[PDB]
Amino acid sequence: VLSEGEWQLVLHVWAKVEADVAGHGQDILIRLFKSHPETLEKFDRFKHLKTEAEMKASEDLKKHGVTVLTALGAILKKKGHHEAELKPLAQSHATKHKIPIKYLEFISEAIIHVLHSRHPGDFGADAQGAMNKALELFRKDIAAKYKELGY
Ligand code: HEM
């Protein structure tokens, strides 16, 4: 369970993200796809993209990054009380999009990396640790839903 102090560190840096949702979403998905190409293959929308420049030029990718970060922000602001938000997300990702938990670990690493690059003054080690804990909680709770469903 995150402490109040940990949630403050998480939401302080997240408020900085929300100033440029789309640019963060691009950086994060591109890092994900470059660092873990298996993840790109899960996206019929995006698997035609073969270079970083093509990824950065795709408006559809930018739109999707906004969708992803908007959902994540809504979850983070619940400070753990996110059951209702995770239900549909876990269901779609387990049963329709077929995303392993490990790939959620990979996107978490990309989120952390981009936050560090964009917001170093609000993302020192204490804040990095807190954000890691928040994304771990996210994964833990999705994984329990995956297990219920047999994924
Ligand atoms: C922070 C973690 C993530 C969040 C918050 C998130 C959120 C979302 C949201 C809100 C949607 C649209 C509604 C829905 O279908 O549930 C979606 C769609 C989708 N997600 Fe995620 N997602 C996450 C991680 C991932 C990862 C790591 C992958 C793949 C490696 C993935 C693959 C997909 C796919 C394939 C779709 C459908 C895209 C389409 O064709 O329109 N998601 N995600």
As annotated, the binding site for heme b includes 93
Sign of CA dihedral 40, 112, 60, 77: positive
List b or e across 38-72, with b for residues whose CB sees 16 or more CB atoms inside 10 angstroms: ebbebbeebeebeeeeebeebeebbebbeebbeeb
Cα 77 to Cα 134: distance, rounded to the nearest angstrom = 11
Tokens describing residue 70: 């908007």
Please tell me the distance between residue 5's alpha carbon and the centre of ligand 1 in angstroms. 29
Ligand 1 atom 2, closest CA = 104
CA nearest to 76, candidates 130, 125, 134: 134
CA nearest to 29, candidates 110, 105, 135: 110
Please tell me the distance between residue 121's alpha carbon and the centre of ligand 1 in angstroms. 29
As annotated, the binding site for nitrite includes 64
- Please compute, for residue 96, the number of CA atoms within 13 A of its CA located in the half-sphere on the CB side: 7
Question: What would the DSSP string read from start to end of 47-106?
Answer: TT--SHHHHHH-HHHHHHHHHHHHHHHHHHTTTT--HHHHHHHHHHHHHTS---HHHHHH
Contact partners, residue 61, CB within 8 Å, separation at least 6: 26, 29, 30, 45, 46, 49, 55
Cα 129 to Cα 107: distance, rounded to the nearest angstrom = 16
* Ligand 1 atom showing the smallest separation from residue 67 Cα: 10
Cα 16 to Cα 10: distance, rounded to the nearest angstrom = 10
Options 3.40.50.20, 1.10.490.10, 1.10.260.40, 3.30.70.930; CATH for 1-151 is 1.10.490.10
Residue spans of the domains in the chain: they are 1-151
- Please compute, for residue 120, the number of CA atoms within 13 A of its CA located in the half-sphere on the CB side: 1
Contact partners, residue 136, CB within 8 Å, separation at least 6: 108
